[PDB]
């Protein structure tokens, strides 16, 4: 839901007050994605 | 565009294409002639 | 209901249409060259004609 998937693009296009919102969107997204990966890996490691 | 003598009606809004040139946006955002200068998905300063 | 260590009353005069520039993350002559509020400003802005 951010204006771009690239972080530098947001930084180079917006001022801090709005770049903050966009980066919050990206951070939420990517952090969620990492948690997913780690959980899957925990379970898979249990199987192994 | 800005110093155009006559403007078009909103229903028949004019479109000018800008290409293959250097855009000094300071001339716009440093001008005191504008009541509304609202930029979406971009910060004016960064335009440079 | 609240206490604070300090309060700062910053007083000045502007024209009506520029009152909007006295707010966090605003742009223009006033917000840029005269008086800038932080993006994380915690306080009140009072203006009257």
UniProtKB/Swiss-Prot annotation, chain A:
Top-level taxonomic group: Viruses
Effect of residue 12 to A: In strain: Alpha/B.1.1.7
Function: Subunit of the fusion protein that is processed upon entry into the host cell. Mediates fusion of the virion and cellular membranes by functioning as a class I viral fusion protein. Contains a viral fusion peptide that is unmasked after S2 cleavage. This cleavage can occur at the cell membrane by host TMPRSS2 or during endocytosis by host CSTL. In either case, this triggers an extensive and irreversible conformational change that leads to fusion of the viral envelope with the cellular cytoplasmic membrane, releasing viral genomic RNA into the host cell cytoplasm.
Protein name (Swiss-Prot/TrEMBL): Spike protein S2'
Residues of the full protein shown: 971 to 1018 of 1273
